[PDB]
Every structure is written in structure tokens, then in C-alpha cells.
Design a protein around this nucleic acid. Sequence first.
RNA 1: UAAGUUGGGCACUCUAAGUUGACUGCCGGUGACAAACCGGAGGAAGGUGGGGAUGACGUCAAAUCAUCAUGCCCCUUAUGAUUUGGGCUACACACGUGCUACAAUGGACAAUACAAAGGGCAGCGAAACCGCGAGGUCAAGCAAAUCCCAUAAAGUUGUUCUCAGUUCGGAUUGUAGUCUGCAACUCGACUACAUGAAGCUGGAAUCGCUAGUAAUCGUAGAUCAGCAUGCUACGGUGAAUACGU
Lengths: 60, 102, 84, 109, 128, 147
Amino acid sequence: AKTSMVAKQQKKQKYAVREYTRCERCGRPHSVYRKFKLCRICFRELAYKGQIPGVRKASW
Amino acid sequence: MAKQKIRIRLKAYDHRVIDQSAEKIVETAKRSGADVSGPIPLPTEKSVYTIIRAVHMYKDSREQFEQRTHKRLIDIVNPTPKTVDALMGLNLPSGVDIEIKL
Amino acid sequence: SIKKGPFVDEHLMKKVEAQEGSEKKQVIKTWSRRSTIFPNFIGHTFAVYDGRKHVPVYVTEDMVGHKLGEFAPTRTFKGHVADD
Amino acid sequence: ARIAGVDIPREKRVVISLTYIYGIGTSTAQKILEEANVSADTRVKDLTDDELGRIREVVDGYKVEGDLRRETNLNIKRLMEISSYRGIRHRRGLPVRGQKTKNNARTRK
Amino acid sequence: QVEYRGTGRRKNSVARVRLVPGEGNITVNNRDVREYLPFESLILDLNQPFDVTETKGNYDVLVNVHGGGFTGQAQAIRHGIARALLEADPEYRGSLKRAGLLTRDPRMKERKKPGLKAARRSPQFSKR
Amino acid sequence: VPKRDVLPDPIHNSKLVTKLINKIMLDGKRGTAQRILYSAFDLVEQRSGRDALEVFEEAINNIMPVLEVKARRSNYQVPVEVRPERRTTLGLRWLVNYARLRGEKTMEDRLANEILDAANNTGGAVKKREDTHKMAEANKAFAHYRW
RNA sequence: UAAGUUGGGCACUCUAAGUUGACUGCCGGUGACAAACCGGAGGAAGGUGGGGAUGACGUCAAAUCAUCAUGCCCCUUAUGAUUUGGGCUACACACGUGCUACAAUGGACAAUACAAAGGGCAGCGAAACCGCGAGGUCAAGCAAAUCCCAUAAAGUUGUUCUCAGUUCGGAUUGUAGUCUGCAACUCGACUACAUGAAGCUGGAAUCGCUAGUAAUCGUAGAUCAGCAUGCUACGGUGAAUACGU
């Protein structure tokens, strides 16, 4: 289950890195970028909303 | 090269907004002074982020993004508290990334 | 692969020091993953928790190529029908 | 026989004629060549007796013999001795680290 | 003296031609052409602009060039040659354009798309 | 659909060499092929003294097929005259293929042997030409009243 | 001057803004005078220029309740919650995908020229010294056209090897070491030494590709306490053929 892992990745840790960087809203840890800390699908979808500075056009 | 100078660096994500801001700043700089350096372009670094058009499988249908980043350089010689105000007074619109230096 | 130095579990040290100064025990409870066997670890019966039930293994002098890290595997027959 | 240790092919260059012997590959061969002042020279056995003696005496510097095989057998024997997990994995083509055997049946068995 | 200068662009490379009439000798980047092309024996193709245009020749040449592999830039010289020979006289254009050597190629590499990988190979299908 | 020929390869001054080298350059390494072709063409001049032009031209002359067959439809196969471009392409192709099949250890000597033995109206390229000319122009009975 | 390193220079390249340009646009011929077709000139670029982004109504009751949201149903002193260890990596084998070999266009050593793009703040680690080596000391510079990653590699000049399971191949194992992490034992990566396997181009069957493509060589990034033959992206080199439906 995901609910308690929100606390798990929030609480202090015994040592330096027992952590993983997941998205704040989406609970999916996989396929996330440290520049934004949003997951794959959420950041793709918010790109279409025209909220995050930058572009999605590609073709480059 | 040694000389009196004021140098600034400009950053924004729209070529029109950045070049119009550079134009207005050049106007104000030569207004309260002279011998100003023009809006020298810069290789305008880009970005890229590969992401799959998908929810659960099918990495084959990938799709791409970028974050283009215009960068601008302007230099000013023979400073005065007038060019200081001409720099730190008007930067609008506030999508541009200004950092005043010397 | 550590040249920084050995890494014996201090916790195993604290117990085994008292266990060794006086008469030893022939059964020990531990977890024994962050440590290894050293000359002063001889003559004991430690038990690496394989995951299901920790199995006590008696320390011998000759285990220098081998260590405390693991002796009772979790694969445990086999996982397969045939043999090696 | 013949020039050092055992199993040395006639009329062959030293750099490769010093490999067939069990215990030297390609680096320490050239190292002891620099020690003994010898040459391939090209490709044929030009090794004269005055330098046969020197190379035959220098070759003892390393533990090059069937003794290397003996040491390997006693090492694996002890490693399997303490009912050691590593001894069990020595039969599975599984090194001290692991190899994720799913297709690792061809090269070993 | 007088000097004619025209650029040359091909295959992600850039050429700065310095053409000055003379007995005919080229030293690319202060280094002779044989000292810059591997192996190579294809410099006579670079002399083809001098074989069909300004027959037979020749003009001394100095060039500084960087970027890209040796083929793309060793071929970039010819378009600067043609530009300079047209600057010298428009008569040479009639002999140039019937054979090319002035039209800078518009073809370079292509991006890459799903199907290609570390080597430029397309994927297979699932047989059996 | 057109060809887009390659024009200059004045090493040595000739044109067939220019097309030839582009086949030996396996995995896109043109300099090795150029070097070995040059060494072989100097070698064929060295042994059995003659010019490279005569031996090469007459060799590709003895090994250029002039008639060839193509299949279509039961099993029938129309013999067809070969275009000069495809003529030389097939000649060089089979010449290099049988030089590969020769299997010699040298950079250059296999090609020299191949072309100089072809210069004697013998050799595996000549064998291929003879085999094709035997299967062809002997069964030109059925598909001759066709394209 | 070691040097574009500095005086200067902005001619050139380059850099990014705007425009100019290619739109059957002009001519000749064909063609129901039309559409349209063919050739020619011009031009850097002639018949949607090259490429990418974009995927119609709908089909496969295609996939996803494990991103998420959510109807209905089920659990709750547990179908929820914490921790340590184990496991997702097992092993007679089958298949897929790919990497490396089965070597004289080659093997090893020596010298040597040519990229682009991207990343970097508490990150990039320059020089120097140490060490065969992975690496260790050191600390300059660096929020970036400045400094670093970063020698590009293939490639070219040479010597040698001279057809062998080969100085081929580099699989397996042991030893000694390097870095991360608390801990590399089930399961990290890396170097040196020791071994040197199968394998001498592959059957039935089968896949991809019409020109910068394939073949082939390197590079960087993401994810990342440490770990990518995979992915994305970039450059290098680079042809054969398309008779014809």
C-alpha cells in the first residue's frame, strides 16, 4: 500500500540514504526527475496545461 | 581586458520578451549614458526530457519535450548612478531573469 | 571489499565480549549481516538468521576464506527439481 | 626440458613461448624478459645456452609450477569444507558474488 | 596583392578560404594537405574545380578549418573555391554550374527515432 | 532509380576502380580497401610484367557475362541481355566474391592471382560465367518470344 | 604570446532576432484550351525540398481499479500499520531481444589529425605528486559561449605476428587490490596477476534497409549512497543495387 510510504519517505531515516524521491501528488516513485520532483504522467499532463515554464513541442 | 564596465546577463523563455526587454534596457542605458553594448545573443541552451506516451506499457511510443533558454548579454561603460537606476528600475515583464553586476 | 577497515557489528561485539571472557555458549541469537569472522570470533555457536529460522553454526579455526556472512541459504532445495 | 619449466615449443618467439607454461600469461613474461635481458628475438628460438642458464635460474622467482594447481585445489577444497555456502555455489558456476543462473548451463556444464 | 575570400560549408563543418593567385600550393591550418588527409589520394578531386574551372590553374591557397570528420571538411574547400572564382570573374560560373561544385549540399545526418539504438539499426519482429 | 555515379578515382587513372573499391569497403573503411587495391594492382604489374590497365581490362572482359537469365511465372526463366552498368556490376561482384572464396592470407596476392588467372581465360569467375552461359542460351527456347 | 594570451580589430566564422527566398514560379511542348504531365533555365534549394510534431468517424467489450480519480462489492483488533532479515536475482531446460567471438580489410606495441551535443554548486575536480593499475593527496578555476567532464574513437604512419583454437578469442575460477555505502555473504561496480572454454560464419526457417540510409566507430545525458550490452540524444565514417509490377 502507498499511504504509509508517504510518511516513510517523509520521516527521518537511520542514516543518509534509505530514501527515494517520489512525486508529491502522484504516489509513483518510478520515472521521476529531480529538477521538478514530479512523476512521468503528472508532469507530462501538466505540460499540456501550460503551467510549467518550457515546452512539450519536441521535434528537435 | 581592463576597463570600467557594467555587465549584465539576461534570461527568459521567450525570444520576443527577452529581446524587447533588452531593447528597452539599452534605450534606458544610452539614455542616461553612452557607449553601451548591444543585446549580444548567446547560444541559448536547450533541454530535453524523453517520456513515453503511456500509462502501463508501450515504451515504443515515446515523445519528447525541451525547455529552451534564451540568454542575453549587455555591457555598459563609464558608469553613473543614472545607469544604475536605468538597470534596477525597469525589468517588466517579470518573466525575464535579470542579475545586475559590475 | 573494504580497505577502510573491518566492519564487525558492534552489537555482536558487546555480547560476544562478555560471552568470551567467561565460559562461552553453544547457542547465540543474532542477525549477523553487518559483520564477519575474525581471529577472536573462534569457538562460538552463532546463528545467522537465514530468514525463516536462525541456524546456529559452530565457529571453527579454519574459516578464513569463509566468513560469518552466510552459511544456510534461502534458496534451500533448490529452487528446482534437478541438482547441480 | 626444455628452456624453463615444461612445455616449451621449439623455434618460437619468447613472448609467446613463455606462455604455454602454466603460471604466466602475457605481462610477467615481459617483466622477466626485461629481468633476463632477452628477445623473441623475432619469432624463432635464438635462445643460446649462456642465456638459457640465466633464464632457467630467474624463472624460479615466481610460484610457477603444478603447485599453483595444488594451491587452487586446496583453496576450493577448504572453501567447500566448512559446509560453506561458497562451496555449494562452486558447483553451480556461481562465483563468490553470483551470476544469476538462468542460462548459465552452457559454458559450465 | 589582392585576395578573395569565400566561405565553405558542408557536413557540420566550416571553411575559411584564403585564395591568393600564384604558382599553386595549399597548406591547411599551416600544414600541407597530404599532412592533413588520411591516407589520402583523393586531393585530385579537390583539384577538379581547377581542372574544369580556371583550366589549368593555379592559385595559392591558405585555409583554416575545424569541425567534423576529414571528408566533410576536405570537401568544403571546393564551394569556397567556386565562390572565389565567381567573385574573380562571372565567366567561370557557366562552367561551374554545368558540373555543380558551387551548390552547397543541403544533406546532413538525421535525427533519431524509436527503432534505432546505439548503432543505426532498425528493430526486428517476433517470429515463431 | 537513377544511378548517381562516382566520377574521379585517378588512382590509378581509371573509372572501374572507383566503383570497385566501394564494394571492398566492408563496414565503411575506405582507406584499407584503397591501400590493398593499390598494392594488388602494383603487384599484378610486378609479377608477370605488364601494365595494370591491360590485365584488368581484359580480365573483366573475360569475366563479364553478356547474357543472363531471370525467372517468372510453372517454373520458367527468361534469358535476358544485361545492361552495361549491371554487366560491370556483376563482373566486379563475382570477381570479388571468388577472390574471397580463394581464401589466401595476403592483402593483395589473392586479387592478383584472381585477375591474372582470369587473364588466362580460367578461374572461378570464368567458371561462373561459363556456368551461367551454359544454363542460359541453351534453354532460350521457351521465353524467347517474350520481353 | 606556449597560446588569441592581450592592444586592437568584428573583415570572416560563429551566436540569435527579423526578414528575403521555393509558391507550377517562368518558358516550351503535351494535354477537353482545364486540371495536370514532361523538359529547360534560374537559383543554395523545383513539382507536399529533407525531417519531425500532428493519427479522421470508428474497429480490436485492446490495456490500465497497480499512477490517479472513481460506481458497486469485500477487510478492519486486520485483506490495514512498524521494524530486522530474506526475496523479487533460484534452476533440468524452452523462446525473445541484444552484446562479444569463431582473426589476416586481422592481433599486439609505438607515434599521430579530425567532432557535435549535453551536464556540472555544494556539483565539475585543473595542474602537480604517488601508484603497473583501478585509484589516493592536493587544491586552482568553475552557477557557466569563460573552468571542468574531454584523449574523441574509427581513422593515418610504422614494427612485429604469418594461418594454428592461433600474442585468436576472453568465457570460467582463485588470489591481491580500488571506490560507494554502516554492510558488497545470498546481490554493486572496478583494476592487476593466475586459467584460457565453446567457438574457424552457421541448417530448416527468418528480420531490417532505396543514400548520409544501411554497415560501422565513438560520445554524452537521464534515472543514480554506489551499479546500464538497455533507453534517449549527438557526432564520425559510409556504399551496392531498385531490370520491372
